[PDB]
Amino acid sequence: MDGLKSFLSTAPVMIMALLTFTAGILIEFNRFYPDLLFHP
Amino acid sequence: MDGSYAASYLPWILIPMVGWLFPAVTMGLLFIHIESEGEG
Amino acid sequence: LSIVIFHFSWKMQSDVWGTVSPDGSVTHVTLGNFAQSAITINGWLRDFLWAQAANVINSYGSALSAYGIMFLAGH
Amino acid sequence: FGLYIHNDTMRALGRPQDMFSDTAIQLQPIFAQWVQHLHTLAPGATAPNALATASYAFGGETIAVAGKVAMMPIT
Amino acid sequence: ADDFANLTPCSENPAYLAKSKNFLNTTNDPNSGKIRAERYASALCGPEGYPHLIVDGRFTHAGDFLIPSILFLYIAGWIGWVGRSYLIEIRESKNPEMQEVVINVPLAIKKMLGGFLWPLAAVGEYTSGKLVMKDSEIPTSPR
Amino acid sequence: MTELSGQPPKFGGSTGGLLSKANREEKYAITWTSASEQVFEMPTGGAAIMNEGENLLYLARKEQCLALGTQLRTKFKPKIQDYKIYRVYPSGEVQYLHPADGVFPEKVNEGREAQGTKTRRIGQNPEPVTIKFSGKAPYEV
Amino acid sequence: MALSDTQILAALVVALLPAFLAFRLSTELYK
């Protein structure tokens, strides 16, 4: 309901969600392309 | 404890004088001074 | 509690834990050094902290490297 | 802590005989040693139906499993 | 012709080769160490055999700091610009604080999406007056 | 000022009470009239029993007497707004302290002379350099 | 060569002068 939405939209939930999304992105990018110390 | 330098009998009595007598006397003078209740 | 756990670790490594021989000789972890070293603060700094910290600092390039990392992290 | 500071100063000055230690000015934990001895003598005496001591840290044999020592007296 | 004489390319350093023939695998791929020994060979190493980077500005090492600088500055400009526009928009919603602690997800996602043009919008707000405010219209403390 | 009356509260004793200062330097007294024998918190630790009628109590500090006074006037069924606080010197001299002119200071009263008044804002104090090598600070001028 | 006892004792007498002058400067700065 509206209260559950307003809770899931709170600042800690959203910041942890974005941190999780970004961590997934970085971890996977380093999984498929590791050890990029610099660009060739 | 000894000394082969000139007049090596001087630390013999100066070390007690600097470590015991000098601090005792100066602390006693400063003590009687900071506690002095003479008006002014 | 830091002092309590340091006492426990050092006493157990000095006067308890160790290796027994088929003859029965007991070679303790730190060779029974508690009685003469744990009586001075320099003894605790050298023979306890400095000596036994050798594993945490050399833990890099090994499976225990996360322990040295968390060591620096706690500092 | 003052005893530790005294021992650090005495050892630094090259005066080990003036230290607090088992080999100089001894401070023996007399009561704890007495209680350890009472514990050791409990099985068969004050603990008739107890075959062995409650904990070998109070004294007795040096129980060892595998190459390591499981538990032994803690002086 | 003889610049950076204290460094030699990793393909020419024997220490780097002896260490790269034992490079540890990074992921589940058992060729990641060989991929490292291949990739890092083009940069400059040194006596210890570890690759050294050149932030000097010369384009022969443009990949050592220039390209990453561009990438980071783009992403960080996007982040700050969309957050700032979110804050500005929310300011005139009667109760900006509550919307700062409880996010306005529609508006937030909308501002985030429109962040790929953040340098253009930055220049456009500079040429107007939305970017920088005037000092006499800003609170200060006593001198 | 004259003499002080009142019965000491029912109490067995505390370590928080008067010290050598009370006899050597100064002391404070608080009197109040209670409607019944009721328990109250002793500002020096513990619970004491005030008596019906007049009660006189000696405390070490003026702030202790004022804390007891606030407790009397805020924590009791019929409120006690009757307490008077005096400063007692070892010479026997008694000095009436609170409430000054018979009226609590929270409410205004005629015949009171303003003190500490400054006919300007805070931001209108002079610059310290303008008053250096005097003995004054910008609030004292 | 090594300093003599006479040289050590002569320097203490000389140091009696800065002692008196430091006492005087101290007590005057107290004023």
Next chain:
Amino acid sequence: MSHSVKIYDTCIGCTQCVRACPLDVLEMVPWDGCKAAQIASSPRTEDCVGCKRCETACPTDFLSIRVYLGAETTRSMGLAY
């Protein structure tokens, strides 16, 4: 000795400082500078300890009552001995 407690002309006469003061340093006296027709006063600063409860209480944009700590006495140091 004692601290110094000054009352400035931004006083609105809300009296909260007098109620906050735990040593009876302050009073309310009649004034004509504010609507409440009253201004705070510090006629007993020799008892003032300097705990700053008045300043905590003052509502005016920056305090209309200001406590400047000064020479320390046994009364000002809150000493019971």
Next chain:
Amino acid sequence: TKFPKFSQDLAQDPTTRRIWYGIATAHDFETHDGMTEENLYQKIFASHFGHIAIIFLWTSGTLFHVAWQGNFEQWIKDPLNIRPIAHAIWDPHFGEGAVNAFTQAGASNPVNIAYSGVYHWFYTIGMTTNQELYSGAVFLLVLASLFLFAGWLHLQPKFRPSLAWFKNAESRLNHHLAGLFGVSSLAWAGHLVHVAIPEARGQHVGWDNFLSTPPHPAGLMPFFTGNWGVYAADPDTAGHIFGTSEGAGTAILTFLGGFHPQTESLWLTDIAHHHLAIAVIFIIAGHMYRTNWGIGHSIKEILNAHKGPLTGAGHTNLYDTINNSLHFQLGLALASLGVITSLVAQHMYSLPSYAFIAQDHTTQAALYTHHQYIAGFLMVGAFAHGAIFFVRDYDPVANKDNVLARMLEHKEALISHLSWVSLFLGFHTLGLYVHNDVVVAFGTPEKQILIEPVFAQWIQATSGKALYGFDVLLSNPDSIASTTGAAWLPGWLDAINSGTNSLFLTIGPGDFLVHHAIALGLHTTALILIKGALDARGSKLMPDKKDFGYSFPCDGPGRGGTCDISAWDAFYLAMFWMLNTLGWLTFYWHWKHLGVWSGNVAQFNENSTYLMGWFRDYLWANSAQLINGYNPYGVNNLSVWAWMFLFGHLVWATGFMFLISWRGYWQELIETIVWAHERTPLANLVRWKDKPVALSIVQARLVGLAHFTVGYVLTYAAFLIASTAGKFG
């Protein structure tokens, strides 16, 4: 009570605080009761005389103890293999082991070895016997007597200087440049040319003969004519052996750069020539200002004439702003002196002037650390007295619109951009360090972000360092900067291109990372100090802070809470960051020179990139000998340093107590203790003359910082000394 007599307020304090504050405010003459400006300047003048005299007496003690209980004459013979001793030990606490351990360096009684480099100094300047050192110390006794008597005399009314005499900036600048700096440097060049340089060549020149033995065979004839090149003459040969005439030259003024081949220090003739040139320039500069003959500049007119369209009023009235603020003057003196003290530290280890001091690694480490710490204290004090200026002396109407006031006008911009640079540096330097740590931990040290310090290497090349191959300026023979025929260029290049000294030490990624750590430290300490100085007059939490003085406890728990609000608190906080910065810089210096002296530069080069290398390879390892100064097996001469190491740890941790736990808890505990005393019979016979109270809030901050700093300095000093001495470089 009487004490303190300069403060009625403190004098009437009935608590122990009276004592403490009486000690803490003695030298703040401006806030004494009844203080006038003229009496202020006069008291400061006499205090200055006393301080100079104390300095002279200290130097006399150094000379006297080296001459009496040292091994100077022996050390002169074999200065690379003999350790110089400072003074004899007399401690009835010593046992046999310590007595044996401290009869060292050839001595026949317990002794400490000197690390002040004073032997090298006295030997280089021409002193060779204990009799010379003793005569110097007696002369310094006399000089101190003269300055003490002068200080006493200038308190006498007839010799009391007027305020206008103290405020004559032009005459004092003229005299201090031409006379205090100029003629002193000239006289020192004369000593070098007359005594030190002849002594270095096997000749004796003292008061018995210096009249009848010229410094040069030609003597003054070339000086008063043209022909100055005669004094550049034949210099000491590369084979010159210090103290003998073997390979010795006759020149007195040269410019051949580099180092003496045997003593690894600047050539004495170069030093004499430097002092002569500096003397000329300072004497010329000491004529700039107007005094009694119409010619000369008015500083006021110069400052008033420098206004721009973009700086408002310019420097108008800055002459009075500075001439009337002793705190402005003191802040300027402190900042400038701290800068040049760091300069001394950086140049003495790199371009030493005393014979054989470069091979004495413990003295080099100790002197560098000493001067850097002095510089840090001086810088912090400079900014603290700038804040005190803003609090007590700044005038807004006279300084209106000038550069001084304009600095306050945009103080928020300054403070915010200092915050930003500190955050930039901290975030990224810590991030690179932690990346390197993690990447080396997991067994893949090849993935380290190693930035080559190309800019400092390129600067080294511009001065001639060919190692990097930049071929710029002095590293390129074709350069117009190197095709000049400069007489110093061959020697300078020969010195800077041999990897055998500390002249522009080779640098790498470790130096890059520590230099950014240094930049972070400097910026954060400057940010704290500048935020404190610019907000000392007022902020929004305290718009009237100038009415509360430089130092005060706080403003209470209201308005959100105001702990550490005063600018004094900003000083106190900045002290921690200064100590941290100096820790980083001295760690860098000591570890790098440990590698340099040991020949193993690879350790620092490869392990200074991650912080675990700093932890184990620098701190943990080099403690081994230090920490074994005393152990269950015996005692060696490192026992003092081990005990001092522990002492510093203890003092530091003790200061933690005052910093962390604040005051009210202690006042309540002291009240329980007061009750315990007043009720214990027999003890009741005795009563305190001052009421015991807890230390004040500011007093707590200061005492905790004092313990922190004492422990800091002593810990690191014991570590540095013991590690470098046990390893011997």
Next chain:
Amino acid sequence: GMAHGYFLIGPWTLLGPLRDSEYQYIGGLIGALALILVATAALSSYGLVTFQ
């Protein structure tokens, strides 16, 4: 003073540095005499300051 000086012999006598010399009792005595002298100075200073 009789009581205090009598019992102040023991500590150094049995535990001071001269305990293991041929001057054990003399060392204890010397320590006690110095301690009583310092204590006398303290007593007299207290009296000098408290009864002005």
